[PDB]
Amino acid sequence: AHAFWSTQPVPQTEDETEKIVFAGPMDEPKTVADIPEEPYPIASTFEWWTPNMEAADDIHAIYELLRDNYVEDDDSMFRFNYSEEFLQWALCPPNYIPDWHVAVRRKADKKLLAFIAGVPVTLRMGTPKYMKVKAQEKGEGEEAAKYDEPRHICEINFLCVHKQLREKRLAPILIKEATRRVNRTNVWQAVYTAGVLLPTPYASGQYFHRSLNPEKLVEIRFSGIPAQYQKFQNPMAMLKRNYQLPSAPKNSGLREMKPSDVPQVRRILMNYLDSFDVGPVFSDAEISHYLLPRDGVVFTYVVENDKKVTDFFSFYRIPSTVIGNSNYNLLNAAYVHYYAATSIPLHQLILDLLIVAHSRGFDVCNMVEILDNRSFVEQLKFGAGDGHLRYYFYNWAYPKIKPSQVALVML
Numbered sequence: 335a336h337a338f339w340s341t342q343p344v345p346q347t348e349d350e351t352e353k354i355v356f357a358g359p360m361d362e363p364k365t366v367a368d369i370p371e372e373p374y375p376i377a378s379t380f381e382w383w384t385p386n387m388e389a390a391d392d393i394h395a396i397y398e399l400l401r402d403n404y405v406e407d408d409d410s411m412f413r414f415n416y417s418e419e420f421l422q423w424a425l426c427p428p429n430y431i432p433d434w435h436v437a438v439r440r441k442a443d444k445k446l447l448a449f450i451a452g453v454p455v456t457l458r459m460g461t462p463k464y465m466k467v468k469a470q471e472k473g474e475g476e477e478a479a480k481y482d483e484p485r486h487i488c489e490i491n492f493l494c495v496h497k498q499l500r501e502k503r504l505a506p507i508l509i510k511e512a513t514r515r516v517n518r519t520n521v522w523q524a525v526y527t528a529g530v531l532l533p534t535p536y537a538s539g540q541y542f543h544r545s546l547n548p549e550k551l552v553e554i555r556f557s558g559i560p561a562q563y564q565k566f567q568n569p570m571a572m573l574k575r576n577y578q579l580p581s582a583p584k585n586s587g588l589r590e591m592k593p594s595d596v597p598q599v600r601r602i603l604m605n606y607l608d609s610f611d612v613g614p615v616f617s618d619a620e621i622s623h624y625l626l627p628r629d630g631v632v633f634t635y636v637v638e639n640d641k642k643v644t645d646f647f648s649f650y651r652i653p654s655t656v657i658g659n660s661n662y663n664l665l666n667a668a669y670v671h672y673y674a675a676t677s678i679p680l681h682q683l684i685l686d687l688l689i690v691a692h693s694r695g696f697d698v699c700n701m702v703e704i705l706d707n708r709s710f711v712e713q714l715k716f717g718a719g720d721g722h723l724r725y726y727f728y729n730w731a732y733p734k735i736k737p738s739q740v741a742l743v744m745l
């Protein structure tokens with residue numbers, strides 16, 4: 335059934351997955367020395383390309399490939415339109431490896447045809463807590479703790495094959511060449527997410543959306559007026575009323591994050607993420623990179639009364655193309671990013687997120703049910719969307735966990 339994934343070091347069935355009790359590798363340990371020096375052979379009409387992310391033109395080429403060919407919703411009404419500034423931020427964290435950005439171009443004109451990207455991430459990915467309890471009961475605590483230390487691995491994103499090249503098994507070649515490049519740096523695990531079912535996820539979660547401009551959402555058919563609203567004389571006016579927000583934040587102390595907050599946000603964030611089974615470990619340079627505000631891309635606010643950062647939240651922006659509306663070209667969506675609350679309840683912190691996003695002209699706020707995102711879905715009037723996001727490892731055996739035990743946000 336899976337000619338490519340059946341040759342790879344991943345759990346092959348949910349049964350396979352059910353028998354996993356400890357984290358650790360799937361494969362045979364290998365060395366850099368064992369891995370072929372040369373790129374994987376490709377058809378003579380194509381060529382491998384490593385784009386330079388410091389070069390405006392190379393970012394622009396990847397931006398056009400994704401603008402026209404990347405992920406669409408299931409009804410083909412919307413397609414993600416990551417900006418060039420977003421791609422530079424996502425693709426180039428501190429100590430990124432330029433060789434992990436893998437492209438295929440057509441030789442005859444240098445047209446970009448396929449892309450995949452890897453970035454370094456440091457991830458806690460040891461045995462989950464529930465499985466450590468079961469281990470203690472069996473007397474098997476040392477095996478359970480072997481891979482407890484944060485690991486330097488690759489996070490894969492942005493796999494995209496041009497529409498004209500679909501179903502020609504081009505995706506497997508990209509994945510194998512990315513794997514070769516990552517392995518040649520002595521990294522043997524990757525983490526990736528997808529909104530498709532592949533062999534075989536370690537967690538799965540629903541998407542959630544919070545309307546901020548319901549009249550536009552209904553006009554572009556992101557949203558429907560629900561049936562229940564028909565009992566009203568003016569269904570749309572009641573819908574707008576239901577989702578209305580304050581103009582200004584409720585928490586005094588709220589202000590944009592600035593560089594001097596980095597150490598305190600790193601502290602409160604790392605203390606929070608600690609509670610989760612799978613989650614990233616960020617250095618000060620990484621906190622700086624992923625959280626300091628960047629126009630049009632990432633927005634971060636802290637709660638500081640009496641000169642101490644006690645809470646913060648962040649969100650990032652991705653516009654989507656609206657495929658053929660006379661009125662609207664773009665859906666401007668905000669995505670919940672990392673956050674930590676130590677002094678106020680999380681629903682009150684995220685309410686300020688929604689108020690900030692609405693004030694800045696976003697149409698909808700989106701999130702996956704990771705972190706503690708469930709604790710605020712009802713009060714903050716989030717609705718479950720369609721389908722599920724699945725989380726995967728490459729070359730890592732891992733027990734199934736709940737999405738509330740996952741703390742890695744994928745951009």
Ligand SMILES: CCCCCCCCCCCCCC(=O)SCCNC(=O)CCNC(=O)[C@H](O)C(C)(C)COP(=O)(O)OP(=O)(O)OC[C@H]1O[C@@H](n2cnc3c(N)ncnc32)[C@H](O)[C@@H]1OP(=O)(O)O
Pocket residue numbers: 335336337338339340403404405406488490491492493494495496499500501502503504505506509512513516517521522523524526527528529530532728729
């Ligand atoms: C240690 C280092 C390791 C680093 C690598 C780690 C692994 C990283 C894995 C990648 C993580 C990506 C994370 C993201 O970015 S998820 C976002 C993926 N991108 C899109 O959905 C954008 C639109 N779609 C496309 O561009 C194409 O349809 C893609 C590229 C998805 C497939 O192109 P195409 O339609 O032309 O298909 P094909 O004939 O070439 O190939 C068919 C084979 O590909 C398998 N397939 C289909 N969809 C996915 C998918 N989303 N992840 C993994 N595999 C997928 C499929 O099951 C089949 O295998 P098998 O069933 O025959 O066995």
Ligand SMILES: O=C(Cc1ccc(F)cc1)Nc1cc([C@H]2CN(C(=O)C[C@H](O)Cc3ccc(Cl)cc3)C[C@@H]2CO)ccc1Cl
Pocket residue numbers: 405406407408412413414490491492526527528529541542543652654667669700701702719723744745
């Ligand atoms: O925005 C939507 C709805 C939507 C689907 C398709 C569209 F064209 C526009 C909107 N879904 C949605 C998507 C995400 C994030 C999940 N996500 C990933 O897991 C990264 C993956 O490597 C690629 C991927 C991209 C998009 C999706 Cl939907 C699923 C997988 C990127 C997405 C943006 O950061 C987080 C929360 C929600 Cl509600």
Ligand SMILES: [Mg+2]
Pocket residue numbers: 495499500501502503504505
């Ligand atoms: Mg193909």
